[model samples]
Target: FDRITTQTAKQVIVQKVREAERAMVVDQFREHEGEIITGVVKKVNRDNISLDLGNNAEAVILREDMLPRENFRPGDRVRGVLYSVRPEARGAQLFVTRSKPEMLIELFRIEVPEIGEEVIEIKAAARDPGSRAKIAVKTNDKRIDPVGACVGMRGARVQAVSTELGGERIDIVLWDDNPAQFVINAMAPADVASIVVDEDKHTMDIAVEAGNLAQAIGRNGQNVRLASQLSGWELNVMTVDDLQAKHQAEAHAAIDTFTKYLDIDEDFATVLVEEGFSTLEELAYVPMKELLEIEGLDEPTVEALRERAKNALATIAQA
Candidate 1:
């Protein structure tokens, strides 16, 4: 073979070897998926960034994976979560992200030792990239304060994580088994006067004081949105007076239902609703002895009421 032919053969063999090495590296990085990895800045390209992962391995940070307003230059150290592994990528099989909610949890786990010790667990997390984040934490040890541990002394632990995230604000909320109480905890820095939980819809209508309305909602609804994300429930924040009006409207609606379905006078229906009876099913199925406990209902009248409720329910079911 001529010299030119020999050179072309060498280049092809080197390219094949390089492709094999890349495949091996991709396999290695797959094990680290979802783990936090640190690297030095290699290239700050316009559409993406390259991090020198040492030993010829590199990670990419796409535009959407970066925190808002974050800047990186060569030789600077960077930390991010290895969220993905692109085995078929031409370069940089590992995809690292600083904006994912997992990054916040990983950062907190690093800054707060209690997380590793299993004293406190981050049950849920949500983030607005560099702007703000929310994390729900819970601990089984009664003596240990989960939130305080995550916050560290004088907020040192959380502050360090926030600083790394481009000064992103973080809300450390206590987690509860009761979703309503958990959501209430999620809405911190603002007092909640009342809460209505709809289990069917998996939503909550939170009533806050007028003064705390803006604080609860945040600018452009960021606070509530983050809280909703963290709590896994849709949240609607409203003023106390507005919630009261809603309650009043619901009560009127309830009275109307009992009035028509129970075939009772408006006053009698109002009395039933006031006595904590809403649905015909409740009146129909409740023990007669309990209905006899009403303030002014005679035994005969209560019996008649129960009979009427059952008849109404049966009629509706048939229809």
Candidate 2:
């Protein structure tokens, strides 16, 4: 009524009501932001997708956020985390994505009752987005087989998730308190001969049989990539033959250094090699007293040995 006194004041009432309505709608959208929701795909054009949120409040997922380009179709249901939202007077513009790992995590929670109820916990997960993924799960109950529970009876449970993901292969790995063991499980279907884990580096050098190398690596490196992602451990893949060749080359180099840098017999050098001195470089800068204290070797001989190591290193630098 007060606005009726002036034309500009009357215009303000009209604009103010519209702004109030917009604020109400914006609040509704904000309520779900950072929360996952269910939506139906109403349309898809290239990478862009239209989802029906079922309230006439439709949303759009742009090209940069999408699913399998070759597989997503209309009427397909998606569960995604709500992200950026833009509100207009008419409605809201919202974006959702299923490419992220959290999408798979949510799917597991939805499809598997144990996961949803927190009987089994997802420790970590990694995905290749379209083709393959790995998830590590843990459980407090000794009777519960976390991986088998995710797998379901003869593959029913995990398959449902795979189907929704456009047939993306999912590996549910059993979580181990030991990261090394968990990583080995993450590399499913590949028989690992051994894994040399370097605690300082948080990396593991894995060796598989010569015949199993291809399986361990997967096509274009997907298997190992997902394994590393899920396990949170950096992986170094090689075959047993490759590892053997590596040790041989390394041993030869160390032996060569020992022979070149010491005025000692082959037996004495072999003894040093046996005791874990792998490089002439290691001895070059070691404490003079420690070298002098080696049984049957005096200070003069120890000094000469250090001098020999220094000379060998310098020659190598020149080469």
Candidate 3:
């Protein structure tokens, strides 16, 4: 009905409007990255929640990005990280999240002066979202207490972040050059009694209290899983009872290794096993006079068996 309007002009105007909208949306998101943004909750569904991220765009907080107890009603103001922007049936989709580790790190950066000043850097983080999180921090300044700084005075800093994260507990660990120490710290609130490292396998067997078994493992094995992720090593959490059982198995294996070549009676074998001298290498290293001093071993028998044990150890070492 317009007299001078052409199809080409209409197309150009629409295209220009879309470009302007995209630019505005992108700029708004870029400014909000690594910071929390408040938006009105528009709708809540099983899979995701919709928020009105002002300026004609709706932000989506996916189910995977939300805490378990986090619920939003229509018209509620929700705070979250602006993670990304994407196209949807509507104008544009702004992606937001509550479960990202960056949210926790950003909170720390905002609340802690040391973190903000780059005196302390969060090298890596692993989180089970609303249950627990482990962050490894290293400080360039030797004078700063990186862990205490992140925890804030009287736990104020981390407490604020935990509130935002739906009460998730956090452990701010000091980074260690030793992987065993780092892994032990990452599994905090669950004391690690001992850590046995298998350097060849690149794995660890961690012994923990039976009482703290469930806590060490966390909900759905999240604690150990996150510890493994943060420390960059495979971690196996075992109860004290399980570790003892493994010790028994190792003892049996050692005894089997020693007895295979030595012409020792069952009583001598039992004594060696009980005295913790279970391996051929261990028995071979003992002086012949010391072996003869045992209750049942004689000098001649001891010398002959020592030679056999030495050969057995050599074979095992070769293998």
Winning model by TM-score = 1
TM-score, cand. 2 vs. native = 0.69
85-138 per-residue lDDT for model 1 (tens digits): 877667667889999888999888889888988888899999998898899999
Runs in model 2 deviating more than 4 A are 1-35, 54-56, 70-78, 83-93, 251-319
- Sort by TM-score, best first: 1, 2, 3
Give candidate 1's error at residue 319 in angstroms. Answer: 18
- State residue 74's C-alpha deviation in candidate 3, in Å: 1.5
The CA lDDT of each predicted structure is 0.88, 0.81, 0.81
Model 3: clashing residue pairs? none
Q: Which residue runs does candidate 3 get wrong by more than 4 Å?
A: 1-21, 87-92, 209-215, 218-220, 239-319
Q: Which candidate has the top score in lDDT?
A: 1
For each predicted model, how many residue pairs clash, with residues at least 3 apart or on different chains?
Answer: 0, 0, 0
The lDDT, on a scale of 0 to 1, for candidate 1 is 0.88
lDDT of 3 by residue, 42-140 (tens): 888879888886666678889988888887888998888887765443543677888988778877888888888999999889888888888889887
Per-prediction TM-score = 0.75, 0.69, 0.67
